[PDB]
Each structure stands twice: as structure tokens, then as C-alpha cells.
Paper text:
As a part of the hypothesis, we have proposed that T. pallidum contains an acetogenic energy-conservation pathway that catabolizes D-lactate, yielding acetate, reducing equivalents for the generation and maintenance of chemiosmotic potential, and ATP. This enzyme is putatively identified as TP0094 and, in this study, we determined a high-resolution (1.95 Å) X-ray crystal structure of the protein, finding that its fold comports with other known Pta enzymes. From these facts, we infer that TP0094 can act as a bona fide Pta enzyme in T. pallidum, and we propose to refer to it as TpPta henceforth.
The structure is divided into two domains, called “Domain I” and “Domain II” according to established nomenclature for Pta enzymes. Domain II (amino-acids 150–305) also features a mostly parallel central β-sheet, but the penultimate of its six strands is antiparallel. Although several water molecules are observed in this cleft, there was no evidence of substrates or products bound therein. The two monomers are intimately associated, burying 2,640 Å2 of surface area, and estimates of the energetics of this dimer using PISA indicate a strong likelihood that the dimer is stable in solution (i.e. ΔGint = −22.6 kcal/mol). Moreover, the C and D monomers adopt an “intermediate” conformation in which Domain II is rotated only by about 5–7° relative to the open form. It is this intermediate conformation that most resembles the conformation displayed by both monomers of TP0094. Thus, the conformations of Pta may be important for the enzyme’s catalytic cycle, and the intermediate conformation of TP0094 comports with its lack of substrates or products in its putative active site.
Numbering used by the authors:
A (entry chain A), B (entry chain B): 1 to 333
């Protein structure tokens, strides 16, 4: 199958709970109906003002009978959610009443459903800004204990077995979120990209931390080189369970003859399927170069490192983009 | 007609003067022979100790007949070159006699031939470090008046006229030399890359200065975004004669449907053939991704911005590689 087909079938198998806070938006509700029709989720929670949602559904001819509308103003969890948000945020000086008002927002309320164990996967961003989506994620859901940084990746399908990797499948990370990762964040990015490789490609991760330098060739003074080198040291210190090396140029990562000249006895030779970029320009430009100048497909961006999975959509997304993002996030949980 | 054959043919038509300071190296003399045999240059100057050069030739069985040995020890330009070097370098405290000894070095002498008008193109690096070759370039030859920075590009051939560019050809720059260009340096790289587009691809240059941000989308705080935006302002101030725009994501540069959304009314829409990367990691990773994960070929790195063309070879280059480098550098004059 294709990647999208495989992710949808795996979501059907996983039978997890989806929450959608942009439930007054037509595309979101159409996606929710397709999710129900395809059995992509065990439960579909629509979060928002009940009569605004029902009104949108009425006008778009959408049956909600297998969906659960949760209204943050009326929910039985309202008081507990306001209290949990206050405890989370009181260190920034907000009041309990400000917390209660903030938790009437569908985006915050859906994120708190994940934090509190009432749903498994959240998708938003067809109508909210990326900044708002990531902020709800960072401040309500938080990160896994193994990282301090939330990041993102793309799944790159070169549609060419022979191009190395895992039958031409790669994880590229972080090509969308963190502008200039510190050495510690870069190590976090590598750890989360390793998890993404296991979830999305289904093979063991072999990770190359990339640079214009290979194992010293660029010198010892450029902070950008040292940042990547320090990340590699940090990964050794952390005793991670995946194979990794850096700093490596792309050709040293992917062409064994070159690895043998520039990085001898490197443990990644001939096996790399996960590329960690040194900064956001290199990764954002890089994945687009592969997408737009070759027959490769790029899937994502997929968020990683969050304690519970969420996705941020483009504001111009299609219904099927929403469905695809929901399936991937459900498979991540 | 391939790219290497196109350049070889064009050098034959151009009938320029080549200087080779590594004339005691066997591959260089074998290349020199092919260059004479193929009429790729009007004149082939071998620079060095005539006896060491003749000795190498005899040991290897190489005929030198239509080549001209120019011996820095006895050349009629001996005293003028020493004075010129002294004037260039006296601000570092050297004496005239030291300048004269310095100008017995074949590499320095070849570069001075370019500066003084006695040859058109220099190739070295088969047995000199890149740093040595570049330093000779910068201290002796200098840069064109339109820039203060020498840099490099690659000619990328996607082998697919629909991918954009000029029949599938692109200039990528600077993917090999400057680790973190200042805004002034990025503007210089754009100017030099536009020159290389004209020389190597043969079409009008349309230059995209790349970033993870498109026309403000990544905000106004990240210094790497501002460096690119500043370089664009600088190009406007210089009133350059090529079309440019930035900061642009790669898809906004290359995909007009996306340009119309993220960069409406951009001057580059649908015409970009020259990509300027914001730093060396993004460019070095970027060109290699295209080379290694697609059908594209990568030719270079080609130096650019020097007042007279020179080329740095790889230490392990083939004889045919040397010939191809000479032809490109001659086409560059």
C-alpha cells in the first residue's frame, strides 16, 4: 500500500479516541464523518459550542449520531479542567477565574482532554494558527519524560528502493518547528525522530546528525559544527538504544564508499534511514528540495516529543488532509 | 550534448590562455597534453622550475612541445611581479626581498600572471590545499569590483525540463566555501551566482534567496531570517540588473501556485533558476540531497567572484577531471 493507506489501516486497527476542537468548521466536520465512515477512530469528540456545531452540521448535511459533542461551558469536567489549568499556569501569575475562562476555549479544552486521559489524539490548525496549536500542546500536554523539546518530522518516500534508507523511506527532522536547536535540543530531536522512524517506517532507526562537516573536516571553531558534535556526545551520555553518528555530511551519511573515506568505522554506514538537520533552514529547504526536484513524496509535518499526540494542520488544508493527519496522530498514540 | 562536452567545445571556441602551477605533477602534465591535443586553450603555460618540470615530463614520457615553460626564476616578469607583490603585501611588514622569494612559488606566480594580464585562467589544487589556492586567489588576484567576497556554486542538472530552471538546470550557491555569510556576503554570493548562471546555463538569472521563512512568515526576531532579508535590501540598494527576491522558502521559489499565496506579486514567479542558500550547512546538505536522492548531476564546485577565473581541484582528481576543470575556468574568462 501507499503510506497514507497504510496509516489509515493502522488507525482502524488501533481503535483510539479522537478529539476535534475546530468542530464549527465545515471541513473538520466533513472529515469527522469520513473518520466515522472509515472506522479510523473508536470515538470522535467534537469540542465547541453545541448549537454552533449542530448549526454547521445542519447546513452541511452531516449526521453527528456517532459523534460526541462536548461543550466546554457545560461539560461535567469543566470545574476539574479549570483547576488543572490553574495548577499548570499559576506560575505565570494567572487567577483561577482567568483559568476557567481560558478553559472555555475549544483548543485548550481538547488539549486538556488528552492530558486528563479522556481522548488519545488531537488535530487542529485548519482555523487556529500554528503558534496557538503548539502553545496549547506545550503548556497543557507537555513533553515525554525522555525529552525537553517538542519537534517535528517528515516521512520522505523516494518511491525508489535503491536510494538506500529503508526501501527509500526516510525520516527528516526537524524541518518545521525549532529554528536553531541547542545541542541538547538536537539530541532530543534525534531521540524523537528515532521514535517516529519506528512508528511510521516500522524499521529500527539509524540516525545521522548532518552538517557541512564530516568528523572534523570543517574545523573546531564553527559553533554550528560544535553544536552537532556536542549533540552526538549527549546521545552517548544518554545511552540511547538506537544507532547514531555525527557530524556527517549528507554524502558521508548515505554513500558507504564515502563514509569509509571520511568517517571510518562509523556505525551508521550503509544503514541510515533518519536524518537530523542542524537548523531549520537546512531542514525546511532540504526536504522541499527532495519533494520538488524528484519523484519523492513528503508526508507531514508530524509533531513528535509530545506526551500525547497532536497535529497542526495548514489553514488551507483539504478534508482528506485532515483525515490523513488524524490517522497518523491516532497511530502515534 | 552533455554539460562537460558543452564546456569543452566552448573553451575551444574561446581560445584563452591557461596557466598551471602544479606542472611537476604527473596528472597535471598528462592533462596539459590532452588540452593541447584538443585545442582547449590557445596557450598552455607550465609554471615552475624548468628543470623539475622537464624532469617530471621525461620520467613519465610526456611531450611538452606546444606548451610554454615559464620559470619564475628567469622570467622577464620576475622583477615586476616581485614589486607588485611587495606593494600588495607590504602592509604586513614584509621586505621587497621576501616578496621576491615569495614570487618564486609557482602558485603565487601563476596567480600573478592573471592579475597582470598574461594569462586568463588558473587551475591548481591537485597537490595544493584548498586553503593555499584560495589564499593566493584572494591576496593576489582579488575579487571583481561588484563584490568583496569570493564564493562558489554548483551547476545542478535535474535532467528534466519540467522541473523548472532553464531546461532543468540550476545554480546552487554557496554550497562549499563561506560557512555563515553576512548580509553583505549573501548579496555578493547572489551577484556572483547570477554571473555563473549566465556563463554555465546560458539563461537570464532569476535568483531566490532561500530561508525557512517566506516574506515574513517566520517572524522578525530570528537573526538568520534577518540576514537573508537584509541581503535582499542590499541587492535593491545596489540596483543590480538581475531579478531576485527573498526571503523565500524553496517551494515558494519554485512552485508558482505557492508563490501566489505566500509571496504574491513576487518578481521571480515561475522563473527561478538560481538558488542562494542562507549558510553552508543548508547549501552543502541541500545540493547533496538533490545529487544523491534524485537523477540530478552536480558539477562543481566552481569558484566565483574572483577578478580572473581560478579553480581548486580535489587532491584525488582524475586526469579527465583536470581537463574539465580547465575548460570551465577558460569558459569563465
Amino acid at each position: 500500500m501507499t503510506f497514507v493507506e497504510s496509516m489509515q489501516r493502522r488507525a482502524v486497527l488501533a481503535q483510539k479516541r479522537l478529539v476535534l476542537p475546530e468542530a464549527c468548521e465545515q471541513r473538520t466536520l466533513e472529515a469527522a464523518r469520513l473518520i466515522v465512515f472509515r472506522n479510523i477512530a473508536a470515538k470522535v469528540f467534537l469540542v465547541g459550542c453545541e448549537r454552533d456545531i449542530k448549526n454547521t452540521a445542519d447546513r452541511c448535511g452531516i449526521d453527528l449520531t456517532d459523534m460526541v459533542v462536548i461543550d466546554p461551558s457545560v461539560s461535567k469536567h469543566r470545574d476539574q479542567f479549570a483547576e488543572r489549568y490553574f495548577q499548570k499556569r499559576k506560575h505565570k501569575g494567572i487567577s483561577l477565574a482567568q483559568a476557567a475562562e481560558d478553559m472555555r476555549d475549544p483548543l485548550r479544552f481538547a488539549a486538556m482532554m488528552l492530558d486528563q486521559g479522556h481522548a488519545d489524539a488531537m488535530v487542529a490548525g485548519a482555523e487556529n494558527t500554528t503558534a496557538r496549536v503548539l502553545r496549547a500542546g506545550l503548556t497543557i500536554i507537555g513533553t515525554l519524560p525522555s525529552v525537553k523539546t517538542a519537534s517535528s518530522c517528515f516521512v520522505m518516500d523516494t518511491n525508489n528502493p535503491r536510494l538506500g534508507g529503508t526501501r527509500g523511506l526516510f525520516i527528516f527532522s526537524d524541518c518545521a518547528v525549532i529554528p536553531t536547536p541547542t545541542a541538547e535540543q538536537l539530541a532530543d530531536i534525534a531521540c524523537s525522530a528515532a521514535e517516529s522512524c519506528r512508528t511510521f517506517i516500522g524499521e529500527e532507526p539509524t540516525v545521522a546528525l548532518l552538517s557541512y562537516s564530516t568528523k572534523g573536516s570543517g574545523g573546531d571553531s564553527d559553533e554550528n559544527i560544535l553544536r552537532v558534535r556536542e549533540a552526538v556526545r549527549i546521545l552517548h551520555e544518554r545511552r540511547v538504544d538506537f544507532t547514531f553518528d555525527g557530524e556527517l555530511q549528507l554524502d558521508a551519511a548515505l554513500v558507504p564508499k564515502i563514509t569509509e573515506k571520511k568517517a571510518p568505522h562509523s556505525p551508521i554506514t550503509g544503514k541510515v534511514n533518519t536524518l537530523v538537520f542542524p537548523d531549520l533552514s537546512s531542514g525546511n529547504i532540504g526536504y522541499k528540495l527532495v519533494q520538488r526536484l524528484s519523484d519523492a513524496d513528503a508526508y507531514g509535518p508530524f509533531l513528535q516529543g509530545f506526551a500525547k499526540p497532536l497535529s497542526d494542520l495548514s489553514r488551507g488544508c483539504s478534508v482528506e488532509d485532515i483525515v490523513a493527519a488524524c490517522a497518523v496522530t491516532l497511530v502515534q498514540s
